[PDB]
Structure formats: C-alpha cells, structure tokens
Amino acid sequence: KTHVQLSLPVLQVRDVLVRGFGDSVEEVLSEARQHLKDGTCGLVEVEKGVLPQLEQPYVFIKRSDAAPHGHVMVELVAELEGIQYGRSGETLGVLVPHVGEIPVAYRKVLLRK
C-alpha cells in the first residue's frame, strides 16, 4: 500500500531515551521508516526548547494534504544544519525511536510509505 494507518505514541522530550535515528540524512530517513513499519517510532511535539534537546539530523512528519478515517496524511522530511530534504506541509512533530517511554497521547496518521 502507498499509505499505512499508524497510531504514534506522543512522547515528552525529557523522557526520550534515544534522541534520534542516526548520523546522516539518508540513515535517519531509513531508520525512521523502519521503526514506523515495526511499531517502534514515537512522536515529539515541537515547541520552544524541544529540538536543541534532540539529536540532528532530525526527522519530521509533515502534513502532505488537507484526513481519511481521522488519520492526517503525512510524509517524512529530514533536517541537518538548517537544510531540509523533502518539501511538505505543517510539522506534526519530530520522530524518535520508541523504547517503552509512556506516551501522553496518540497521533493518528496516514503515512505516505
């Protein structure tokens, strides 16, 4: 399928144990997509002070369109040293590995895969 319905756990930034997916734009997009397929991906909502507490390169989920079955359609965009790789809509959050942190909410998305 070109899209997959996922329910992503929303994590508090200070709880996150593994603060990024790797060391290059290509690696973090690859790892993010793998963790989304495996059900081991969390989402941190971006506010003042969040991104400096996480590791670059960043992986964002961004709105791709204006929401089937309550799932916002999203795609992945990576960021390193102020340059983005991908072009998309509003940020829903920054993706991180999930390793058992307790979420505060879930974010239903339709991931362009």
Swiss-Prot record:
Signal peptide: none annotated. Residues 1-113 are annotated as: Disordered. Changing K37R: In strain: Omicron/XBB.1.5, Omicron/EG.5.1. It is found in: Host cytoplasm. Residues 2-113 form the CoV Nsp1 globular domain. Inhibits host translation by associating with the open head conformation of the 40S subunit. The C-terminus binds to and obstructs ribosomal mRNA entry tunnel. Thereby inhibits antiviral response triggered by innate immunity or interferons. The nsp1-40S ribosome complex further induces an endonucleolytic cleavage near the 5'UTR of host mRNAs, targeting them for degradation. This inhibits the integrated stress response (ISR) in the infected cell by preventing EIF2S1/eIF2-alpha phosphorylation upstream of stress granule formation and depletes host G3BP1. This is Host translation inhibitor nsp1. The lineage of its organism: Viruses, Riboviria, Orthornavirae, Pisuviricota, Pisoniviricetes. The gene is rep. The chain holds residues 11 to 125 of 7096 of the full protein.
